[PDB]
C-alpha cells in the first residue's frame with residue numbers, strides 16, 4: 016500500500032586497509048652476530 | 064655470579080694481552096685472591112693475589128712478566144701482561160679462596176690465553 020517503508024540499512028564499506036606504526040623500525044643487534052673475531056665454542060659469553 | 068672474568072682471547076706468539084676480573088666486593092678479598100692458570104705440566108703456582116686492605120705480594124721468581132692494578136669505582140681488576148709465551152696453554156680462572164681447595168669457592172667464566 017501507499018507509504019514510506021524502511022526496508023534495509025546502508026553501510027559504507029572501507030577501502031584498502033592501513034596500518035601505521037612508529038619511527039622505530041629496527042636498535043643495532045649486530046653487537047653479537049657479526050664481530051670481527053669470534054670466540055670459542057663453549058665459552059658462551061652472555062652478551063645480553 | 065660473584066666473580067666474572069673480563070677480557071682476554073687468543074694470543075699470537077710474540078704478542079701481548081691484558082686480563083681483567085671484575086670483583087663483587089672488597090670483602091671477598093680476604094685474604095688471598097687468585098689469577099690461576101693451568102700450565103702444561105707445570106704445577107699450580109699462584110701469579111696474581113692481593114688483600115682486602117690493599118696489599119700485594121708476588122712470587123719473586125715469576126714476577127718478570129706480570130703486573131697488577133685496581134680501580135675501586137667499578138671494582139674492575141687489571142692484569143697487564145707482557146711477552147706472552149707457550150707456558151699459558153690453558154683457559155684461566157679468577158676465583159676467590161682458591162688456596163683453600165676446589166670446593167669452597169665460586170667459579171665464574173674465565174678466559175683463554177694460548178699460543179703455539
Ligand SMILES: *[C@@H]1O[C@H](CO)[C@@H](O)[C@H](O)[C@H]1NC(C)=O
Pocket residue numbers: 037038039040
Ligand atoms: C620515522 O623517522 C623519521 C622521523 O625523524 C621520519 O622522517 C620517517 O618518515 C620515519 N621513518 C621510519 C622507518 O619509520
Ligand SMILES: *[C@@H]1O[C@H](CO)[C@@H](O)[C@H](O)[C@H]1NC(C)=O
Pocket residue numbers: 044045046048049
Ligand atoms: C650479520 O651477518 C651479516 C654480515 O656478517 C649481515 O648481512 C647480517 O645483517 C647481520 N645480522 C645481524 C643480526 O647482525
